Amino acid sequence: NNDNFDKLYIWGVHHPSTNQEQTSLYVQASGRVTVSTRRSQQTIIPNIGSRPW
């Protein structure tokens, strides 16, 4: 951020319903997403399961 203002970044992380779907899309059995700045840090590990339709 070389600008003179705060930048807000919206991002997310996908939670598949089945392992089959997890592998179709991202190969690895279990994913992981880690977004970080010099002073903060944040890490989500997607959970696989059925939610309501």
Partner 1 sequence: GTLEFITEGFTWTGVTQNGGSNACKRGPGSGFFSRLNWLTKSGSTYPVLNVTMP
Ligand X SMILES: *[C@@H]1O[C@H](CO)[C@@H](O[C@@H]2O[C@H](CO)[C@@H](O[C@@H]3O[C@H](CO)[C@@H](O)[C@H](OC4O[C@H](CO)[C@@H](O)[C@H](O)[C@@H]4O)[C@@H]3O)[C@H](O)[C@H]2NC(C)=O)[C@H](O)[C@H]1NC(C)=O
By the criterion CB under 6 A, which residues form the site for ligand X?
18, 50, 52-53
Q: How far apart are CA 47 and CA 42, in angstroms?
A: 16
Nearest CA to 14 out of 42, 36, 44 is that of 44
Binding range to partner 1, per CB under 8 A, among 1-9, 21-29, 31-39, 44-52:
44-52
Q: Is 48 exposed, middle or buried (0-12, 13-18, 19+ CB in 10 A)?
A: middle
* Residue nearer to ligand X on the CB measure, 12 or 52: 52
Q: For partner 1, give the closer residue by CB, 38 or 51.
A: 51
Nearer to ligand X, 18 or 30 (CB): 18
